[PDB]
Design a protein around this ligand. Structure first.
Ligand code: MG
Ligand code: MG
Ligand code: MG
Ligand code: MG
Ligand code: MG
Ligand code: MG
Ligand code: MG
Ligand code: MG
Lengths: 131, 48, 178, 221, 99, 192, 49, 143
RNA sequence: AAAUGGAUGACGCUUAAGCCCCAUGUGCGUGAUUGCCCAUUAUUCCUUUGGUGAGGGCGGCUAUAUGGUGAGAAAGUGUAGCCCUCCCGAUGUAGACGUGGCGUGGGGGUGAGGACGAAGCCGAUGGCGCGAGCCUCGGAUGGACCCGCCUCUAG
C-alpha cells in the first residue's frame, strides 16, 4: 500500500527546548520549564541565550503528525483491531503494543500481511516479500 | 509597529455557545442557528 | 554645473485687502541650493523689512537667472555674517571665477573655513563683475598680467579607477597584486 | 624549520628536490610606517605570504626629537609587580614594524596568529633573498606621494639607534658590501643584455613581412 | 558590528576592482576545493574509477556585487561554506556564459 | 478625462505667455490637495501630536494619505510638522499610488483593487465607477473628495530607495520634514 | 503589468499611441521648427506696438 | 509567427548561429575551438564539430551556456548537415557509420573553410587553445 | 602642579585617517532628479496562533469489480480542528482569566494485555507534539501483575 506522500515536509525547528543550566546539575531534568526569575537572562531574551517556545514554532497543519514514511500511527492490540484500518489503509499504520506477547504477535502479523495493513513494528522481511 | 492607542478598549464580549448541559436546549439552538443563517428574518436571529 | 547655490530671482507681494488695495510688488535676488530654500529666504526678508508674512502674501514668480558666457573675470562680493561675540560683520571680498554663482559659492566656503560661519548666518548684499585696474587685493591682481606662466610642482597623480594597483614592481610598471 | 630525518627520507623516497612557495618581497625604503602596515595587514588576512626588507629606512612624520620622546613614553609602561611579565619594548626596526602590524590584526584568535606567522621582516637585504626575484613597492604609502616637501620626517633606523638598537653599524657595513657586489655583477652581464636587444632589432628584417605589419599596427615594433 | 550571518559569503576576485566589472560575474558558478581523510563517493564513481580521491568540492553561485570595489556575494546552494575556508582559494568559472 | 487634462495645461500656458509677453505677471491658484507621509516612529509622542496623527490615519511609519488644504486642515498640519513630510502631488504620482498600492475598505476588510466592478460596488454613487474616476476626484479637488479618499485604506509604502537626508531638521535646513512643495514627487517616486 | 493596466483603464492603448507619435523623429523635428517660428513672430509684433 | 509546438521554434541567443566559431568552456575539450553546425529539432542542444583533424573535437552535442560564441563566422551554405539527427546520439571504439558520417561532414567543412579569403589563418586559429593566464581579465575583452 | 603602568577604544594618522564647509554609479563644467555598509523597523512572500472576525459548500442519481485516478465531506465554541478562500493583531514584572491542555494515588463503568514474560530499572533506540509529555526498539535486566477511554475523588 502506497500512502499519499507529501511533496515536502518543513520543520521550523529540530532541536529540543531544554531547561536553563540543566547541564551543570545532575539532578536537573532536560524537560522544559518556564523561567520566572526577576533577573533571568533567558526570560529577558538576551542575544546569546537559549530560546523559549511559543506559538510561532507551530507546525503546518497539512503535514502535522505525519511520520517520514507518510503514515499516521494508530495503536492495535489484537487481530480484531486490524479491520478498523482496512478501508483507510493508505492513511493509518498500525503499532503493536509493547506488552503484547510473542504468541499473540504471530497471529496479528500473519493477518496484517493477508489484509495489506502496514505495521511499523511487524516483520521486516514479510513486507519486502512481494505478492 | 502601530499605534493601537484605543484598540483594546473597543472589543466587546460575545459568546457563541451555551453553558447549559440540557440536550433539548442544544437541539433548539441547532434548529434556529440554521434558520438564522438561511433566512432574511431579524426575528430568527433574535431567537437564536 | 559645478557650483551649488544657483542664482534665483523671486517676485512677490502682499495679498490685497480693503485697507491696502494694489500693494507694491517687490523683486529679490538670492543664492540658494533649490527654489524651496529660495522662497524661504524671500519671506524672511519681506518680514524683517516690510512687516509682511508669508501667510498674507503671494509669490508671483521664482526662476533661475542666466549668466554671461564663459570667461575669466574679477568678482566683488559684499557679504555679512553674524556671531554672538562680535554681532554683525560686514566685508567686501574679491574672487576670480567664471560666473556669479561660482563666486558666491566660493565666498560661502571661504567664510566657513576662515571664520566658521554657517549658511543661515550669512547674508549676501551684492555681486559685481569689476574690471582690472580696480582690484585692491594683491592675491587677485597677480593673475592679471599678460605672459603669465608658472609650472606645476609637487604633483599627486592618480591612475584612472579602472587601472589602479596595490603592489607594483620597482623598476617597471608591471602590477603584482591587483 | 630545519628539516628532520623523517622529512629527508620521505623526500628522497619520492624524489623531491626543492620547493619555493609564492612569496612577495617588498622593499620598504621611503615608505610611511602607518600606511604600509595597514595595507600589509589586510593582504595577510586575505592569505598572502609577504617578506619585507630594508625596514630601517621606514619614515615617520615629525621631527626626530618628537618621535624619540614618543618612544620613551612607551618605554616607561611596565608591570610594577613583576616587569618580566609586563609589556616588552623591542628596539630593532624590524621588530617595531612587526609590533605595528600585530596591532592591526585579531591577535587573540588562531586566525590572527596564523596571519602574523606569514610575515618575515629583515634589516637590509639578506643574502638569502637577493636572488629571489624583483622587489615591489606600495605606491599609496610612498614618501613622495604622502608628505609635503617642506615637512620634517624621521628615519626609523636613526630613531631606534638612540633608544637601544645596537646593530646600526653592522647593518650599514653589510649594505655597503651588497651594493658593491651587486653593482659589479650588473656592470657585468651587460654584453648579454645588449646582444639580446640587438637580436630583436635584427629581427623584423628576417621575419615574415605580414607579421611585421601586424606588430606596427599594435605599436610593438 | 553586532555579528555575522553565515548564509552569505564575500569573495574577492583578482583584477576586478570595480562594480561595473563585478556585474559581469553575476550568476557564475563557484566552488571551494578541499580534501578529507578517506575516499568517499563522487560523481562518476563507477564510470571513471580514476576520479576516486580524498578531494571534495562545495558549489555555489554569485548573486550580486558587494560594495564599490569588485567584491561579490555568494550563496552556497542550501548551506554555509565552512569557516576553515576563510583566506583560502575559491574557483570562479566562466559558465553559464551570456556571451 | 485625458482631454480635460491636456486642455487645462495648455490653457494655463497660454495665459502665462500673454502676461510675460506684455511685461505683467500671472498669479497661480493656491494648491488645493496635499499628500502627507509619516517619517517617524511611535515612541515618545506627546498627547496633542498623538491625537492629530490618529485623526489623519497615520498610525505607522511610511503611511500616506491625501488631504484637502483648507484653513482648518493647515493649522492641524503645523502642529505635527516634525513628524511628517508633505507637498503638492502630480498626476503621475496619483496614478502610481492608486494602480500599484490602492486598497479599498469593504465591510471592514482591506481588499486590493483588481477590476472596475468592485470599485462600482463599493461606491454606490454613479460618478465613481472606474479607477480613472478615483484619480480625477483626487487630482482635481472634486465634489466627492471625502467620499473617495475615506473609502481607501491608508497607503503603505516602502522606505525611500536612495535614502534620506536627515530625519531630524527641516527640509529648508537640509533635513527631511516639513513642506517640500512639488519636490515631494521625487521623494515619493523612490518610495513607491 | 500590461493586462492589468488595460483592465483598469481601457483607454491605455490610445494614450500610448499618442506618446509614440510624440517620440517619432520626423514629427518632432517639424514641431521644434514650428515652435521657434511661432514664438519669434509674436515677439517681433508685440515689440512693434 | 512560429508557434511553441512547432519544431522550428527555438530560443537561443542571437550570437549562436550555424558557422559560428565557439570556445568550449567545460568538459574534456575545455579551451578548444569548434564550429557550430546546427541545432536539434526541438529547443534542444547545439551540435558542434570543430574539424577533427584541426582541433580534435568530434561530432558532439553541447549546451549553449557552456560555449563562448565569437564573431568569426564561416559560410556554411555548401554543407547540408541533413544527416545530423537525434537518433545518432540516441543509440548507446567508434562505429563504422559514425566514422563515415564524420568523414563526410569534415570534408565539406574543410572545403568551406578554405573557401574563405583568410582560409590559412582560420585553420591556424582553429588549432589554438584558450586559457586564462595570471593577470588576465576576461570581463574586459570583446570577443 | 599628584600619588600602581595606560589610554581620541588600540595601532597609528600631518598632499591627514585633524577642523569648517561642498559633492556622487558607469563619463563630476556634454548621462538633471539612488556612491556604498549594518536592525526583532518598512515593503513583499511562506507558516503558526487568537479574533467585536468576513464570505462560501453540506437534499450526495454521470459513469465506473479485482487481478482515467483514489481518498474524504460531522449544520460545527473548544481536536488528529467538517472543508475551502480573505482581512486584522501577536513582546511584557505584579495580577486576572481560558484550554475535547499534560502528568500522579484511589472509586464507579466499558475494553483489552500477561510465564511465547507484568510492574520497576538501564540507553550514541528512534518517531510524534510549540510545550507539559506520549509511543516504539534493544537489554548478553527482571520474575508477577497491569493498562487505554468516559466520569468521581484527593495527603
Ligand atoms: Mg521536535
Ligand atoms: Mg528587574
Ligand atoms: Mg543617515
Ligand atoms: Mg572610535
Ligand atoms: Mg503574551
Ligand atoms: Mg506572572
Ligand atoms: Mg493517597
Ligand atoms: Mg502535599
Amino acid at each position: 500500500v502506497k500512502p499519499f506522500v507529501p511533496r515536502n515536509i518543513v520543520k521550523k525547528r529540530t532541536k529540543k527546548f531544554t531547561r536553563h543550566r540543566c547541564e551543570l546539575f545532575p539532578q536537573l531534568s532536560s524537560s522544559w520549564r518556564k523561567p520566572r526569575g526577576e533577573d533571568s537572562p533567558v526570560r529577558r531574551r538576551y542575544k546569546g541565550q537559549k530560546a523559549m517556545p511559543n506559538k510561532g514554532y507551530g507546525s503546518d497543519r497539512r503535514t502535522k503528525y505525519i511520520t517520514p514514511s507518510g503514515f499516521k500511527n494508530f495503536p492495535v492490540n489484537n487481530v480484531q483491531d486490524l479491520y478498523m484500518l482496512l478501508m483507510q489503509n493508505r492513511k493509518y499504520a498500525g503499532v503493536i503494543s509493547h506488552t503484547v506477547g510473542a504468541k499473540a504477535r504471530k497471529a496479528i502479523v500473519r493477518k496484517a500481511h493477508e489484509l495489506d495493513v502496514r505495521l511499523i513494528n511487524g516483520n521486516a522481511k514479510l513486507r519486502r516479500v512481494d505478492v | 509597529g502601530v499605534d493601537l492607542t484605543g484598540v483594546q478598549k473597543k472589543k466587546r464580549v460575545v459568546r457563541h455557545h451555551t453553558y447549559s448541559t440540557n440536550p433539548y436546549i442544544k437541539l433548539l439552538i441547532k434548529l434556529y442557528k440554521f434558520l438564522g443563517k438561511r433566512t432574511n428574518s431579524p426575528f430568527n436571529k433574535l431567537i437564536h | 554645473v559645478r557650483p551649488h547655490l544657483r542664482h534665483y530671482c523671486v517676485v512677490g507681494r502682499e495679498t490685497p485687502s480693503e485697507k491696502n488695495p494694489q500693494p507694491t510688488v517687490y523683486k529679490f535676488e538670492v543664492f540658494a541650493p533649490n527654489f524651496v530654500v529660495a522662497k524661504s529666504r524671500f519671506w524672511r526678508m519681506m518680514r524683517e523689512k516690510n512687516k509682511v508674512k508669508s501667510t498674507h502674501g503671494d509669490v508671483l514668480s521664482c526662476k533661475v537667472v542666466k549668466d554671461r558666457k564663459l570667461a575669466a573675470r574679477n568678482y566683488s562680493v559684499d557679504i555679512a555674517y553674524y556671531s554672538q561675540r562680535c554681532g554683525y560683520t560686514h566685508m567686501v571680498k574679491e574672487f576670480r571665477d567664471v560666473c556669479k554663482a561660482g563666486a558666491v559659492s566660493q565666498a560661502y566656503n571661504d567664510l566657513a573655513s576662515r571664520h566658521r560661519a554657517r549658511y543661515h548666518n550669512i547674508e549676501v548684499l551684492g555681486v559685481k563683475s569689476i574690471p582690472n585696474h580696480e582690484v585692491r587685493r594683491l592675491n587677485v591682481a597677480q593673475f592679471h598680467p599678460h605672459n603669465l606662466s608658472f609650472p606645476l610642482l609637487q604633483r599627486r597623480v592618480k591612475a584612472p579607477r579602472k587601472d589602479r594597483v596595490i603592489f607594483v614592481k620597482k623598476n617597471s610598471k608591471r602590477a603584482v597584486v591587483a | 624549520v630545519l628539516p628532520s630525518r623523517r622529512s629527508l627520507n620521505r623526500s628522497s623516497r619520492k624524489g623531491f628536490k626543492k620547493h619555493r612557495p609564492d612569496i612577495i618581497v617588498i622593499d620598504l625604503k621611503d615608505h610611511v610606517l602607518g600606511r604600509a602596515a595597514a595595507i600589509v595587514a589586510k593582504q595577510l588576512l586575505l592569505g598572502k605570504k609577504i617578506t619585507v626588507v630594508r625596514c630601517e629606512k621606514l619614515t615617520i612624520a615629525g621631527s626626530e626629537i618628537r618621535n624619540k620622546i614618543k618612544y620613551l613614553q612607551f618605554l616607561r609602561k611596565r608591570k610594577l609587580s613583576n616587569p618580566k611579565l609586563g609589556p616588552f619594548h623591542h628596539r630593532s626596526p624590524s621588530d617595531v614594524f612587526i609590533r605595528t602590524v600585530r596591532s592591526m590584526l585579531p591577535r587573540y584568535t588562531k586566525r590572527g596568529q596564523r596571519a602574523l606567522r606569514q610575515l618575515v621582516a629583515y634589516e637590509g637585504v639578506p643574502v638569502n633573498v637577493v636572488r629571489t626575484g624583483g622587489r615591489v613597492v606600495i605606491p599609496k604609502a610612498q614618501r613622495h606621494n604622502c608628505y609635503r616637501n617642506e615637512r620634517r620626517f624621521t628615519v626609523l633606523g636613526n630613531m631606534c639607534k638612540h633608544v637601544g638598537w645596537k646593530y646600526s653599524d653592522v647593518v650599514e657595513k653589510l649594505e655597503a658590501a651588497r651594493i658593491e657586489k651587486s653593482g659589479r655583477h650588473h656592470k657585468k652581464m651587460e654584453k648579454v643584455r645588449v646582444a639580446w636587444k640587438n637580436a630583436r632589432k635584427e629581427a623584423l628584417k628576417k621575419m615574415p613581412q605580414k607579421n611585421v605589419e601586424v606588430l606596427k599596427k599594435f605599436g610593438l615594433a | 558590528l553586532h555579528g555575522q550571518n553565515k548564509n552569505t559569503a564575500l569573495v574577492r576576485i583578482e583584477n576586478v576592482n570595480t562594480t561595473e566589472d563585478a556585474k559581469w560575474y553575476v550568476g557564475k558558478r563557484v566552488c571551494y576545493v578541499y580534501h578529507g581523510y578517506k575516499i568517499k563517493r563522487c560523481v562518476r564513481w563507477s564510470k571513471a574509477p580514476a576520479r576516486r580521491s580524498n578531494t571534495r568540492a562545495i558549489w555555489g553561485r554569485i548573486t550580486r556585487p558587494h560594495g564599490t570595489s569588485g567584491t561579490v556575494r555568494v550563496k552556497f546552494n542550501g548551506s554555509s561554506v565552512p569557516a576553515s575556508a576563510i583566506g583560502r582559494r575559491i574557483r570562479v568559472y566562466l559558465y553559464p556564459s551570456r556571451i | 478625462y485625458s482631454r480635460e487634462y491636456r486642455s487645462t495645461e495648455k490653457k494655463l500656458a497660454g495665459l502665462r505667455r500673454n502676461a510675460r509677453q506684455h511685461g505683467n505677471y500671472y498669479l497661480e491658484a493656491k494648491p488645493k490637495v496635499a499628500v502627507v507621509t509619516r517619517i517617524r516612529g511611535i515612541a515618545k509622542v506627546p498627547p496633542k501630536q498623538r491625537k492629530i496623527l490618529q485623526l489623519l490615519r497615520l498610525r505607522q511609519i511610511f503611511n500616506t494619505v491625501f488631504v484637502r488644504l483648507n484653513k482648518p486642515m493647515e493649522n492641524m498640519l503645523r502642529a505635527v510638522e516634525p513628524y511628517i513630510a508633505y507637498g503638492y502631488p502630480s498626476l503621475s504620482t496619483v496614478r502610481a499610488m492608486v494602480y500599484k498600492r490602492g486598497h479599498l475598505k469593504i465591510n471592514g476588510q482591506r481588499v486590493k483593487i483588481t477590476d472596475n466592478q468592485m470599485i462600482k460596488d463599493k461606491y454606490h454613487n454613479d460618478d465613481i465607477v472606474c479607477a480613472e474616476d478615483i484619480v480625477n476626484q483626487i487630482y482635481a479637488c472634486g465634489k466627492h473628495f471625502r467620499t473617495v479618499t475615506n473609502g481607501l485604506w491608508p497607503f503603505k509604502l516602502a522606505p525611500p530607495a536612495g535614502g534620506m537626508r536627515q530625519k531630524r531638521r527641516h527640509f529648508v535646513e537640509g533635513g527631511d520634514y516639513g513642506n517640500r512643495d512639488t519636490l515631494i514627487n521625487r521623494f515619493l517616486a523612490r518610495m513607491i | 503589468n500590461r493586462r492589468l493596466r488595460l483592465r483598469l483603464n481601457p483607454f491605455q492603448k490610445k494614450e500610448k499611441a499618442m506618446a509614440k507619435g510624440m517620440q517619432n523623429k520626423k514629427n518632432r523635428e517639424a514641431r521644434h521648427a514650428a515652435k521657434v517660428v511661432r514664438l519669434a513672430k509674436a515677439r517681433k509684433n508685440v515689440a512693434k506696438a | 509567427k512560429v508557434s511553441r509546438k512547432s519544431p522550428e521554434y527555438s530560443t537561443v541567443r542571437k550570437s549562436c548561429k550555424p558557422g559560428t566559431i565557439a570556445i568550449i568552456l567545460a568538459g574534456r575539450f575545455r579551451g578548444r575551438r569548434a564550429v557550430i553546425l546546427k541545432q536539434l529539432p526541438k529547443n534542444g542542444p547545439l551540435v558542434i564539430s570543430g574539424p577533427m583533424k584541426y582541433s580534435g573535437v568530434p561530432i558532439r552535442r553541447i549546451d549553449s551556456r557552456y560555449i563562448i560564441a565569437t564573431s568569426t563566422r564561416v559560410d556554411l551554405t555548401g554543407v547540408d548537415t541533413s544527416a545530423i539527427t537525434p537518433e545518432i546520439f540516441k543509440r548507446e571504439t567508434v562505429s563504422d557509420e559514425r566514422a563515415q558520417l564524420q568523414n563526410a561532414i569534415d570534408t565539406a567543412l574543410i572545403q568551406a573553410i578554405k573557401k574563405d579569403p583568410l582560409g590559412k589563418e582560420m585553420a591556424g586559429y582553429l588549432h589554438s587553445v584558450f586559457t586564462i593566464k595570471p593577470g588576465d581579465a576576461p570581463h574586459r575583452l570583446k570577443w
